[PDB]
Short mmCIF file of C-alpha atoms (C1' of nucleotides) and ligand atoms in Angstrom, two decimals:
data_model
loop_
_atom_site.label_atom_id
_atom_site.label_comp_id
_atom_site.label_asym_id
_atom_site.label_seq_id
_atom_site.Cartn_x
_atom_site.Cartn_y
_atom_site.Cartn_z
CA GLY A 1 138.73 -43.99 -153.27
CA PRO A 2 138.49 -47.05 -150.96
CA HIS A 3 137.18 -44.85 -148.12
CA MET A 4 134.50 -42.75 -149.81
CA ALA A 5 131.11 -43.94 -148.55
CA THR A 6 128.49 -44.27 -151.24
CA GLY A 7 125.35 -44.66 -149.15
CA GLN A 8 124.58 -48.07 -150.63
CA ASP A 9 124.32 -49.93 -147.33
CA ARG A 10 120.53 -50.32 -147.06
CA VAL A 11 117.55 -51.21 -149.25
CA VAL A 12 114.63 -48.86 -148.50
CA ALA A 13 111.21 -48.69 -150.08
CA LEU A 14 108.44 -46.18 -149.90
CA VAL A 15 104.91 -47.41 -150.68
CA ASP A 16 102.29 -44.73 -151.37
CA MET A 17 98.65 -45.44 -152.09
CA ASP A 18 97.25 -44.12 -155.37
CA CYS A 19 94.52 -41.43 -154.99
CA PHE A 20 93.91 -42.99 -151.63
CA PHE A 21 90.65 -41.53 -150.30
CA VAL A 22 89.14 -41.90 -153.79
CA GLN A 23 90.05 -45.63 -153.83
CA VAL A 24 88.47 -46.06 -150.40
CA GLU A 25 85.24 -44.56 -151.74
CA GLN A 26 85.42 -46.51 -155.02
CA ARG A 27 85.79 -49.83 -153.24
CA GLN A 28 82.67 -49.00 -151.20
CA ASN A 29 80.63 -47.70 -154.16
CA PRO A 30 81.26 -49.57 -157.42
CA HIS A 31 79.45 -46.83 -159.38
CA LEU A 32 82.47 -44.59 -158.82
CA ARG A 33 84.98 -47.07 -160.23
CA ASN A 34 86.91 -46.09 -163.37
CA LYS A 35 85.26 -42.67 -163.42
CA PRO A 36 86.42 -39.09 -162.97
CA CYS A 37 85.68 -38.58 -159.32
CA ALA A 38 86.85 -36.71 -156.24
CA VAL A 39 86.44 -36.70 -152.48
CA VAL A 40 85.13 -33.50 -150.92
CA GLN A 41 84.71 -32.00 -147.44
CA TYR A 42 81.78 -29.68 -146.47
CA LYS A 43 79.18 -29.53 -149.27
CA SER A 44 77.50 -26.22 -148.50
CA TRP A 45 80.30 -23.86 -149.43
CA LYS A 46 80.94 -24.06 -153.18
CA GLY A 47 80.15 -27.78 -153.43
CA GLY A 48 82.84 -28.77 -150.93
CA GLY A 49 86.61 -28.61 -150.86
CA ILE A 50 88.32 -31.34 -152.92
CA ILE A 51 90.92 -33.34 -151.00
CA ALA A 52 91.55 -36.28 -153.39
CA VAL A 53 91.15 -36.80 -157.14
CA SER A 54 91.01 -39.89 -159.34
CA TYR A 55 93.45 -40.09 -162.22
CA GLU A 56 90.55 -39.89 -164.69
CA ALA A 57 89.53 -36.54 -163.16
CA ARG A 58 93.14 -35.31 -163.07
CA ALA A 59 93.12 -35.59 -166.89
CA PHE A 60 90.53 -32.77 -166.93
CA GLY A 61 92.69 -30.57 -164.69
CA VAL A 62 90.88 -31.26 -161.44
CA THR A 63 93.16 -30.79 -158.41
CA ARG A 64 93.25 -30.96 -154.64
CA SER A 65 92.23 -27.64 -152.98
CA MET A 66 89.72 -26.73 -155.72
CA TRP A 67 86.13 -26.09 -154.73
CA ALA A 68 83.94 -28.77 -156.28
CA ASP A 69 81.78 -26.16 -158.05
CA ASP A 70 84.96 -24.97 -159.76
CA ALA A 71 86.14 -28.51 -160.55
CA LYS A 72 82.75 -29.09 -162.22
CA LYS A 73 83.55 -26.28 -164.67
CA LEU A 74 86.58 -28.31 -165.87
CA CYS A 75 84.91 -31.71 -165.64
CA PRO A 76 81.11 -31.47 -165.80
CA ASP A 77 80.57 -35.21 -165.25
CA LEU A 78 82.83 -35.35 -162.18
CA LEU A 79 81.44 -37.67 -159.52
CA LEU A 80 81.84 -36.82 -155.86
CA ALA A 81 82.02 -38.67 -152.61
CA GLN A 82 81.72 -36.75 -149.31
CA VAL A 83 83.74 -37.17 -146.16
CA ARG A 84 81.53 -38.25 -143.29
CA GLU A 85 80.44 -35.49 -140.95
CA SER A 86 79.98 -36.16 -137.27
CA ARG A 87 79.27 -33.63 -134.53
CA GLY A 88 79.48 -30.82 -137.08
CA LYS A 89 82.93 -31.68 -138.37
CA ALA A 90 84.64 -33.79 -140.99
CA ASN A 91 85.39 -37.26 -139.65
CA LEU A 92 88.25 -39.22 -141.17
CA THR A 93 87.59 -42.60 -139.49
CA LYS A 94 86.91 -44.52 -142.70
CA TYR A 95 90.28 -43.53 -144.16
CA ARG A 96 92.15 -44.19 -140.92
CA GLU A 97 90.65 -47.71 -140.78
CA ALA A 98 91.52 -48.33 -144.44
CA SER A 99 95.09 -47.15 -143.69
CA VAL A 100 95.32 -49.74 -140.90
CA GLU A 101 94.33 -52.49 -143.40
CA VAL A 102 97.27 -51.56 -145.63
CA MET A 103 99.81 -50.99 -142.87
CA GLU A 104 99.04 -54.40 -141.37
CA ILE A 105 99.72 -56.16 -144.69
CA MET A 106 103.00 -54.28 -145.18
CA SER A 107 104.06 -55.24 -141.64
CA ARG A 108 104.06 -58.93 -142.65
CA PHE A 109 107.05 -58.22 -144.90
CA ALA A 110 109.13 -55.89 -142.71
CA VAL A 111 108.96 -53.48 -139.81
CA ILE A 112 107.44 -50.30 -141.24
CA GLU A 113 107.60 -46.60 -140.55
CA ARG A 114 104.13 -45.09 -140.97
CA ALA A 115 104.84 -41.81 -142.71
CA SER A 116 101.28 -40.65 -143.35
CA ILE A 117 97.77 -42.03 -143.63
CA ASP A 118 98.69 -43.58 -146.99
CA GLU A 119 102.38 -44.27 -147.02
CA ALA A 120 105.02 -46.20 -145.25
CA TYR A 121 108.75 -46.71 -145.53
CA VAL A 122 110.14 -50.23 -145.35
CA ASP A 123 113.74 -51.26 -144.56
CA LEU A 124 114.25 -54.33 -146.73
CA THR A 125 117.97 -54.86 -146.16
CA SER A 126 117.48 -58.03 -144.06
CA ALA A 127 114.71 -59.46 -146.20
CA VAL A 128 116.88 -58.96 -149.28
CA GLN A 129 119.79 -60.78 -147.65
CA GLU A 130 117.47 -63.67 -146.80
CA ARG A 131 116.07 -63.85 -150.34
CA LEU A 132 119.56 -63.70 -151.92
CA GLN A 133 120.63 -66.78 -149.95
CA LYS A 134 117.53 -68.64 -151.14
CA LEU A 135 118.07 -67.58 -154.77
CA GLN A 136 121.54 -69.14 -154.80
CA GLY A 137 123.21 -66.95 -157.42
CA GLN A 138 120.40 -67.70 -159.88
CA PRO A 139 119.32 -64.90 -162.28
CA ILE A 140 116.30 -62.67 -161.71
CA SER A 141 113.64 -63.01 -164.39
CA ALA A 142 111.89 -59.93 -165.81
CA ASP A 143 108.70 -61.88 -165.00
CA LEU A 144 109.36 -61.21 -161.33
CA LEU A 145 109.26 -57.42 -162.01
CA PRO A 146 106.06 -56.87 -164.06
CA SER A 147 105.38 -53.33 -162.89
CA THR A 148 108.94 -52.06 -162.30
CA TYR A 149 110.68 -49.12 -164.00
CA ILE A 150 114.41 -48.70 -163.81
CA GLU A 151 115.06 -44.98 -163.62
CA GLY A 152 117.46 -43.80 -166.35
CA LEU A 153 116.91 -46.77 -168.66
CA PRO A 154 116.72 -47.55 -171.49
CA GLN A 155 119.79 -45.60 -172.62
CA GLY A 156 122.43 -45.91 -175.32
CA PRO A 157 122.75 -46.93 -179.00
CA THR A 158 109.51 -48.75 -179.71
CA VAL A 159 107.21 -45.79 -179.09
CA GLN A 160 104.84 -47.25 -176.47
CA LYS A 161 105.00 -46.83 -172.69
CA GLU A 162 105.14 -50.49 -171.67
CA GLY A 163 107.66 -51.18 -174.42
CA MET A 164 110.04 -48.59 -173.00
CA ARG A 165 109.54 -50.03 -169.53
CA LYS A 166 110.49 -53.52 -170.66
CA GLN A 167 113.44 -52.24 -172.71
CA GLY A 168 114.85 -50.47 -169.66
CA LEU A 169 114.26 -53.46 -167.42
CA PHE A 170 116.00 -55.76 -169.92
CA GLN A 171 119.09 -53.50 -170.07
CA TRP A 172 119.24 -53.44 -166.28
CA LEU A 173 118.90 -57.19 -165.77
CA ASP A 174 121.36 -57.95 -168.57
CA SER A 175 124.01 -55.93 -166.74
CA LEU A 176 123.46 -57.36 -163.26
CA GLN A 177 126.19 -59.37 -161.45
CA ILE A 178 124.01 -62.09 -159.87
CA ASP A 179 126.91 -64.08 -158.41
CA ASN A 180 127.83 -61.22 -156.07
CA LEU A 181 125.60 -61.12 -153.00
CA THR A 182 127.09 -57.81 -151.81
CA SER A 183 126.35 -55.91 -155.06
CA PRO A 184 124.14 -52.90 -154.21
CA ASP A 185 122.41 -52.99 -157.62
CA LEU A 186 121.58 -56.67 -157.09
CA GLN A 187 120.30 -55.89 -153.59
CA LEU A 188 118.00 -53.17 -154.97
CA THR A 189 116.70 -55.56 -157.62
CA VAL A 190 115.82 -58.21 -155.06
CA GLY A 191 114.24 -55.37 -153.05
CA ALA A 192 112.04 -54.58 -156.08
CA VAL A 193 111.01 -58.27 -156.34
CA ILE A 194 109.88 -58.19 -152.69
CA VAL A 195 108.00 -54.91 -153.26
CA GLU A 196 106.14 -56.40 -156.24
CA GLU A 197 105.02 -59.16 -153.86
CA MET A 198 104.01 -56.63 -151.20
CA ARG A 199 102.04 -54.51 -153.66
CA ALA A 200 100.30 -57.60 -155.03
CA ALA A 201 99.36 -58.59 -151.47
CA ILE A 202 97.94 -55.14 -150.76
CA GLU A 203 95.86 -55.18 -153.95
CA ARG A 204 94.65 -58.77 -153.46
CA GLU A 205 93.68 -58.27 -149.82
CA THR A 206 92.22 -54.75 -149.94
CA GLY A 207 91.41 -53.85 -153.52
CA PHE A 208 93.69 -50.80 -153.33
CA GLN A 209 96.47 -50.08 -155.83
CA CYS A 210 99.64 -48.26 -154.92
CA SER A 211 103.00 -47.14 -156.25
CA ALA A 212 106.41 -47.61 -154.74
CA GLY A 213 109.99 -46.41 -154.85
CA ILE A 214 113.00 -48.66 -154.15
CA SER A 215 116.42 -47.17 -153.42
CA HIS A 216 119.11 -46.93 -150.75
CA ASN A 217 117.47 -44.34 -148.49
CA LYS A 218 114.15 -42.70 -147.70
CA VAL A 219 114.61 -39.53 -149.76
CA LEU A 220 115.46 -41.43 -152.95
CA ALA A 221 112.76 -44.00 -152.34
CA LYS A 222 110.15 -41.24 -151.98
CA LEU A 223 111.39 -39.45 -155.07
CA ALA A 224 111.42 -42.75 -156.98
CA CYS A 225 107.82 -43.56 -155.98
CA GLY A 226 106.43 -40.51 -157.71
CA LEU A 227 108.32 -41.04 -160.97
CA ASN A 228 105.85 -43.60 -162.40
CA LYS A 229 102.69 -43.31 -160.31
CA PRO A 230 100.02 -44.71 -160.53
CA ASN A 231 100.16 -48.47 -160.11
CA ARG A 232 103.89 -48.84 -160.84
CA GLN A 233 107.11 -49.02 -158.88
CA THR A 234 110.44 -47.40 -159.68
CA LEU A 235 114.00 -48.47 -158.82
CA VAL A 236 116.49 -45.57 -158.41
CA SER A 237 120.04 -46.92 -158.26
CA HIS A 238 123.04 -45.05 -156.85
CA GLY A 239 124.39 -44.82 -160.41
CA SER A 240 121.20 -43.13 -161.63
CA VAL A 241 121.61 -40.17 -159.28
CA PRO A 242 123.90 -37.79 -161.23
CA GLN A 243 121.69 -37.72 -164.31
CA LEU A 244 118.45 -37.71 -162.29
CA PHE A 245 119.60 -34.83 -160.11
CA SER A 246 121.11 -32.84 -162.95
CA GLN A 247 117.70 -31.45 -163.93
CA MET A 248 115.76 -32.08 -160.69
CA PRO A 249 114.36 -28.89 -159.14
CA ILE A 250 115.50 -28.54 -155.52
CA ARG A 251 111.90 -28.22 -154.29
CA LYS A 252 111.12 -31.80 -155.37
CA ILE A 253 113.31 -33.33 -152.66
CA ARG A 254 111.53 -34.16 -149.35
CA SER A 255 112.00 -31.29 -146.82
CA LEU A 256 113.17 -28.80 -149.47
CA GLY A 257 109.68 -27.86 -150.74
CA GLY A 258 109.36 -24.82 -148.47
CA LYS A 259 111.42 -21.91 -147.15
CA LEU A 260 114.69 -23.84 -146.71
CA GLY A 261 114.61 -25.01 -150.33
CA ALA A 262 113.81 -21.49 -151.48
CA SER A 263 116.82 -20.21 -149.50
CA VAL A 264 119.13 -22.82 -151.11
CA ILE A 265 118.04 -21.56 -154.55
CA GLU A 266 118.37 -17.88 -153.61
CA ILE A 267 121.58 -17.92 -151.61
CA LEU A 268 123.48 -20.25 -153.91
CA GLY A 269 121.96 -19.11 -157.21
CA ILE A 270 121.22 -22.63 -158.40
CA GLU A 271 118.11 -24.48 -159.57
CA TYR A 272 118.78 -28.24 -159.58
CA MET A 273 119.77 -30.68 -156.87
CA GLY A 274 122.87 -31.79 -158.76
CA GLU A 275 124.32 -28.27 -158.70
CA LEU A 276 124.81 -28.66 -154.95
CA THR A 277 127.84 -30.93 -155.50
CA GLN A 278 129.98 -27.87 -156.31
CA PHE A 279 129.99 -26.60 -152.72
CA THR A 280 132.14 -27.83 -149.86
CA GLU A 281 130.44 -29.25 -146.80
CA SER A 282 131.69 -26.26 -144.80
CA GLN A 283 130.23 -23.85 -147.35
CA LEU A 284 126.87 -25.56 -147.07
CA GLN A 285 127.00 -25.59 -143.26
CA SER A 286 127.86 -21.89 -143.27
CA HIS A 287 124.63 -20.99 -145.06
CA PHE A 288 122.18 -23.57 -143.78
CA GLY A 289 123.59 -24.68 -140.42
CA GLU A 290 125.66 -27.68 -139.32
CA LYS A 291 122.82 -30.21 -139.61
CA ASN A 292 121.21 -28.98 -142.85
CA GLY A 293 124.62 -28.35 -144.44
CA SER A 294 125.91 -31.90 -143.81
CA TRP A 295 122.56 -33.29 -144.95
CA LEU A 296 122.65 -31.30 -148.20
CA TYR A 297 126.26 -32.26 -148.92
CA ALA A 298 125.47 -35.96 -148.69
CA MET A 299 121.99 -35.78 -150.21
CA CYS A 300 123.07 -34.16 -153.47
CA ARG A 301 125.35 -37.22 -153.94
CA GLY A 302 122.44 -39.62 -153.30
CA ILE A 303 123.46 -40.35 -149.70
CA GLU A 304 121.23 -40.05 -146.65
CA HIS A 305 121.23 -41.87 -143.32
CA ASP A 306 117.81 -41.16 -141.77
CA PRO A 307 116.66 -44.57 -140.45
CA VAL A 308 113.34 -46.23 -141.15
CA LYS A 309 111.89 -45.85 -137.65
CA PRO A 310 110.01 -48.80 -136.19
CA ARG A 311 106.70 -46.98 -135.73
CA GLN A 312 103.40 -48.26 -137.15
CA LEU A 313 101.06 -46.05 -135.13
CA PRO A 314 100.59 -42.27 -134.97
CA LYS A 315 102.23 -40.58 -131.91
CA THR A 316 99.39 -38.10 -131.40
CA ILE A 317 95.63 -38.18 -131.81
CA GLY A 318 94.16 -34.76 -132.60
CA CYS A 319 90.85 -33.10 -133.48
CA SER A 320 90.56 -29.65 -135.00
CA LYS A 321 88.10 -27.30 -136.62
CA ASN A 322 88.33 -23.93 -138.33
CA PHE A 323 85.69 -21.21 -137.94
CA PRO A 324 86.66 -18.77 -140.71
CA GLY A 325 85.52 -15.20 -141.36
CA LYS A 326 82.03 -14.39 -140.15
CA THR A 327 81.74 -17.82 -138.53
CA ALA A 328 84.33 -17.11 -135.82
CA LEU A 329 83.16 -18.14 -132.35
CA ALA A 330 81.97 -15.14 -130.33
CA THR A 331 80.02 -16.46 -127.34
CA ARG A 332 81.09 -18.44 -124.29
CA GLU A 333 78.40 -21.04 -124.93
CA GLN A 334 79.54 -21.30 -128.57
CA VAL A 335 83.16 -21.92 -127.58
CA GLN A 336 82.06 -24.39 -124.93
CA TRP A 337 79.79 -26.28 -127.31
CA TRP A 338 82.49 -26.77 -129.96
CA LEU A 339 85.20 -27.70 -127.44
CA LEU A 340 82.79 -30.33 -126.31
CA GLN A 341 82.22 -31.58 -129.87
CA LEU A 342 85.98 -31.93 -130.39
CA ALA A 343 86.44 -33.58 -126.99
CA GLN A 344 83.75 -36.12 -127.77
CA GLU A 345 85.43 -37.14 -131.00
CA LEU A 346 88.78 -37.26 -129.22
CA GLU A 347 87.41 -39.44 -126.43
CA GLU A 348 85.95 -41.88 -128.96
CA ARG A 349 89.26 -42.15 -130.81
CA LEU A 350 91.26 -42.38 -127.59
CA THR A 351 89.10 -45.13 -126.11
CA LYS A 352 89.40 -47.18 -129.31
CA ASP A 353 93.14 -46.54 -129.31
CA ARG A 354 93.58 -47.76 -125.73
CA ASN A 355 91.72 -51.03 -126.45
CA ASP A 356 93.52 -51.70 -129.75
CA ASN A 357 97.02 -50.61 -128.96
CA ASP A 358 97.55 -51.01 -125.19
CA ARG A 359 98.53 -47.43 -124.50
CA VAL A 360 97.16 -44.28 -122.87
CA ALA A 361 97.66 -40.60 -123.65
CA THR A 362 98.84 -38.45 -120.72
CA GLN A 363 98.87 -34.89 -121.98
CA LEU A 364 96.13 -32.78 -123.59
CA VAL A 365 97.27 -29.96 -125.87
CA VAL A 366 94.82 -27.12 -126.57
CA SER A 367 95.38 -24.64 -129.40
CA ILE A 368 93.35 -21.72 -130.73
CA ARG A 369 93.57 -18.98 -133.33
CA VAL A 370 91.98 -15.59 -132.73
CA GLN A 371 90.63 -13.45 -135.56
CA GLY A 372 93.17 -11.01 -136.94
CA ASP A 373 96.06 -13.32 -136.13
CA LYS A 374 98.08 -14.21 -139.23
CA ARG A 375 99.67 -17.19 -137.49
CA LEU A 376 98.29 -20.73 -137.73
CA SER A 377 98.00 -20.70 -133.94
CA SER A 378 97.55 -17.88 -131.47
CA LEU A 379 97.79 -19.75 -128.18
CA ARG A 380 99.00 -23.24 -127.36
CA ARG A 381 98.77 -24.62 -123.85
CA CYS A 382 98.96 -28.08 -122.34
CA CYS A 383 97.40 -29.71 -119.30
CA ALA A 384 97.13 -33.20 -117.80
CA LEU A 385 94.99 -35.80 -119.55
CA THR A 386 94.07 -38.00 -116.60
CA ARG A 387 90.70 -39.39 -117.71
CA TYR A 388 89.21 -40.28 -121.09
CA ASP A 389 86.15 -38.12 -120.52
CA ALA A 390 84.88 -35.57 -123.00
CA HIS A 391 83.25 -33.22 -120.49
CA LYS A 392 86.40 -33.14 -118.38
CA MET A 393 88.62 -32.68 -121.41
CA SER A 394 86.44 -29.85 -122.75
CA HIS A 395 86.22 -28.16 -119.35
CA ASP A 396 90.01 -28.43 -118.89
CA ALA A 397 90.57 -27.06 -122.40
CA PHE A 398 88.38 -24.05 -121.60
CA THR A 399 90.35 -23.38 -118.43
CA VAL A 400 93.74 -23.13 -120.13
CA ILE A 401 92.32 -20.74 -122.76
CA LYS A 402 89.58 -18.75 -120.95
CA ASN A 403 92.03 -15.94 -120.14
CA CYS A 404 92.39 -15.24 -123.85
CA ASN A 405 88.98 -13.64 -123.84
CA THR A 406 89.88 -9.93 -123.76
CA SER A 407 86.19 -9.09 -123.27
CA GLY A 408 85.20 -7.64 -119.91
CA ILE A 409 81.72 -8.83 -120.83
CA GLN A 410 81.86 -12.41 -119.59
CA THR A 411 79.34 -13.93 -122.01
CA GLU A 412 80.98 -12.55 -125.16
CA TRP A 413 84.32 -13.73 -126.54
CA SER A 414 86.91 -11.38 -128.05
CA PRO A 415 88.72 -11.53 -130.30
CA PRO A 416 86.48 -14.22 -131.82
CA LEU A 417 87.97 -17.71 -132.29
CA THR A 418 88.79 -18.86 -135.84
CA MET A 419 90.21 -22.29 -134.85
CA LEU A 420 89.98 -24.84 -132.02
CA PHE A 421 92.37 -27.82 -131.74
CA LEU A 422 92.62 -30.59 -129.14
CA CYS A 423 95.44 -33.11 -129.29
CA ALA A 424 96.25 -36.11 -127.07
CA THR A 425 99.99 -36.69 -126.72
CA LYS A 426 102.65 -38.37 -124.52
CA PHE A 427 101.48 -41.99 -124.66
CA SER A 428 102.48 -44.54 -121.99
CA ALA A 429 102.03 -48.31 -122.17
CA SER A 430 98.85 -49.72 -120.63
"C1'" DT B 1 87.54 -21.08 -145.85
"C1'" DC B 2 91.88 -31.70 -141.09
"C1'" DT B 3 95.39 -33.81 -140.03
"C1'" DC B 4 100.63 -35.61 -138.21
"C1'" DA B 5 106.14 -35.42 -137.26
"C1'" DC B 6 110.00 -33.02 -135.80
"C1'" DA B 7 113.63 -29.02 -135.10
"C1'" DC B 8 114.68 -24.99 -132.43
"C1'" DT B 9 114.99 -22.49 -128.26
"C1'" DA C 1 107.45 -25.92 -122.54
"C1'" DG C 2 105.80 -23.21 -126.69
"C1'" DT C 3 106.66 -21.78 -131.65
"C1'" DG C 4 107.35 -22.81 -136.12
"C1'" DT C 5 108.28 -25.64 -140.72
"C1'" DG C 6 107.03 -29.24 -143.81
"C1'" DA C 7 104.28 -32.69 -145.28
"C1'" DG C 8 100.02 -35.93 -146.48
N1 0KX D 501 96.81 -31.75 -148.34
C1 0KX D 501 96.29 -33.08 -148.28
C2 0KX D 501 97.04 -34.20 -148.89
C3 0KX D 501 96.50 -35.46 -148.79
N2 0KX D 501 95.24 -35.61 -148.13
C4 0KX D 501 94.67 -36.91 -148.03
C5 0KX D 501 93.82 -37.35 -149.19
C6 0KX D 501 94.74 -38.18 -149.96
O1 0KX D 501 94.01 -39.16 -150.74
C7 0KX D 501 95.56 -38.82 -148.94
C8 0KX D 501 96.93 -39.20 -149.43
O2 0KX D 501 97.62 -38.11 -149.92
P1 0KX D 501 98.60 -38.15 -151.16
O3 0KX D 501 99.45 -39.34 -151.15
O4 0KX D 501 99.35 -36.80 -151.13
N3 0KX D 501 97.65 -38.02 -152.57
P2 0KX D 501 96.71 -39.28 -153.14
O5 0KX D 501 96.97 -40.58 -152.43
O6 0KX D 501 95.24 -38.88 -153.12
O7 0KX D 501 97.16 -39.36 -154.67
P3 0KX D 501 98.51 -39.92 -155.29
O8 0KX D 501 99.13 -38.72 -156.00
O9 0KX D 501 99.34 -40.48 -154.15
O10 0KX D 501 98.18 -41.01 -156.26
O11 0KX D 501 95.72 -37.87 -147.88
C9 0KX D 501 94.53 -34.55 -147.56
O12 0KX D 501 93.44 -34.74 -146.97
N4 0KX D 501 95.12 -33.25 -147.65
MG1 MG D 502 99.01 -41.31 -152.16
MG1 MG D 503 101.06 -40.21 -149.67
#
DNA sequence: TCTCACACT
DNA sequence: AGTGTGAG
């Protein structure tokens, strides 16, 4: 009763850019706007691999991971933009710079956790408290929430999309207790007001549209965000959780999309997140471990405590390239040339990073994959990163891996290399 | 057929 | 440390 925590202590949002790399290319090239289009990497093999898809193209069935030649069979008028290539490899600079534009705007509203190139969590608890004081128990107008869905509503005793959205929003607002500044539902609603303002600022100042989720924790905010993408935001209240989870496949929850989620389904013989409530915490810890078990017990009730970490910048800066099939690297000079290419990109990124962000990397991680190996990495080794110098980095990288060459013949390399990866890690202030 | 964070040991 | 999972 009075002592059962409900996980309603924070207001957390997740903002995720819509078809992000496509919007970056559409802003640059107006001819791609409002068209079925996709962003591809590496044009020579089957037209390139698609990594992002506009919503117009998604209507034709175009998806990420399709070859463009194959996407063209579904959507013959599909337009394409190519990722820049530098030093023989895809170069993601344009998208990293565009990400910084967005993350800097979000940071004006609250400390953010950068979760990926195109999304960030926000802890809005303090901002909401501030705004509630300013509001002075005065009602929240639907006009302040023009792109907000309230998950689960309308419900109870119109056939158009926007009509339903308004109907649900009206039911929600009509039920709100605005004279109680500690009401979690009211706190979420003020959170949604702030997120409308944030999303409007991002669109005004960059041209990019995004979606967002507002709830009491990161997992629910992420789940919420995807419910009404694109260009809308979704509020998932604590009360909405039982119905929402009652038919929600386990794999849809962040961190349960892989082997762990598959094991939950298999071991327990369930399908939906809500079905987890029937197990004791000890039962869950017995199957999935102390940490996962406690997390699952709380999460299936809508409760999660993972903090929004104050981190706006990536913790590592890495450069990698695959050399699949018959392209695997088989000579010393080949391996040395490509390590050098990677090291040169890394140096460029590291130097820019040190000037912008007042920090230096101190460890260089080198990873390879040898042909035949079914693992994503064969060998991983680290060494000291003492100077931002590509020739030194590439020579050092070769040293920590040169004993992998099982060829007595010095010039040849065996087994051939199907992947090289260099990553700068362990940053210190500078 | 290119990235980045984090748990385990 | 090095290996692996999970995700954008
Ligand atoms: N496997 C992946 C997933 C994403 N990305 C890139 C391209 C995406 O535009 C960008 C953001 O990923 P995303 O949020 O999963 N999808 P995207 O923003 O394109 O579409 P939405 O579904 O969010 O509207 O990361 C990638 O290069 N490889
Ligand atoms: Mg996105
Ligand atoms: Mg995303």
